[PDB]
Amino acid sequence: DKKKGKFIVFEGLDRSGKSTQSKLLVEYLKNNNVEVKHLYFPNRETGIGQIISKYLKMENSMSNETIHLLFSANRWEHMNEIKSLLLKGIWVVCDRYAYSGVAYSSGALNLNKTWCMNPDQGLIKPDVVFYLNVPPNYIYEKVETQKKIYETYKHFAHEDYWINIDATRKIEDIHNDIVKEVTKIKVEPEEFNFLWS
Numbered sequence: 001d002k003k004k005g006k007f008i009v010f011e012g013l014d015r016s017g018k019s020t021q022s023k024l025l026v027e028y029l030k031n032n033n034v035e036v037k038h039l040y041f042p043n044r045e046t047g048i049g050q051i052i053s054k055y056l057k058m059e060n061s062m063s064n065e066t067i068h069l070l071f072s073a074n075r076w077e078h079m080n081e082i083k084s085l086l087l088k089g090i091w092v093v094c095d096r097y098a099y100s101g102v103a104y105s106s107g108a109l110n111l112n113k114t115w116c117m118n119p120d121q122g123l124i125k126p127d128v129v130f131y132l133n134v135p136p137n138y139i140y141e142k143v144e145t146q147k148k149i150y151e152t153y154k155h156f157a158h159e160d161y162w163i164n165i166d167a168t169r170k171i172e173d174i175h176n177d178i179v180k181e182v183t184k185i186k187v188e189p190e191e192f193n194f195l196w197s
């Protein structure tokens with residue numbers, strides 16, 4: 001029944017260095033003989049993710065609710081896999097999750113926050129979210145849009161699982177900070193928890 005692996009999500013704006021730091025953490029975990037799967041959302045695992053790619057390339061004109069639900073569906077299609085890995089003691093490091101879903105739809109597309117949160121209710125909750133904080137300053141690439149998304153990400157800032165990381169600092173120092181925070185996580189197995197608990 002118990003979750004044995006740890007689940008770490010990285011969030012942040014498009015440029016914030018999510019993928020660099022997530023890659024570095026994976027490498028650190030592996031170097032230490034911790035088994036780990038590196039995942040990212042959205043992905044192209046099935047046809048759901050293929051439609052999402054066409055959206056982001058602005059090749060289709062999909063409505064805001066339709067795309068929002070495809071992003072959430074792409075997370076749901078991964079829950080079996082993520083549950084099974086964590087049950088086995090394999091850690092999961094994931095680049096973006098439901099927090100992106102809410103921040104981008106509610107920030108960029110002006111969808112109601114609660115409506116945006118609902119379809120991700122019940123997803124596995126991560127142990128920690130590292131939010132790679134880079135203030136936006138001078139699809140979605142316009143700084144005003146980035147600022148809207150930045151503002152909505154603040155909806156999560158007060159939560160205990162949410163770890164703000166100043167991602168303007170040196171790559172090595174960011175990595176050391178993330179390793180420092182990972183070493184604080186409880187080592188013992190625990191019950192699975194779920195969004196938005």
Ligand SMILES: Cc1cn([C@@H]2C[C@H](O)[C@@H](CNC(=S)Nc3ccc(Cl)c(C(F)(F)F)c3)O2)c(=O)[nH]c1=O
Pocket residue numbers: 014041042053056057071072096097098100101102104105139140
């Ligand atoms: C997991 C998730 C992510 N996002 C956004 C949209 C996109 O998936 C990501 C922001 N990064 C982007 S838009 N990268 C990007 C930039 C340019 C281009 Cl062309 C592309 C593409 F190749 F995918 F099209 C991708 O975060 C969402 O809006 N909702 C979600 O649920």
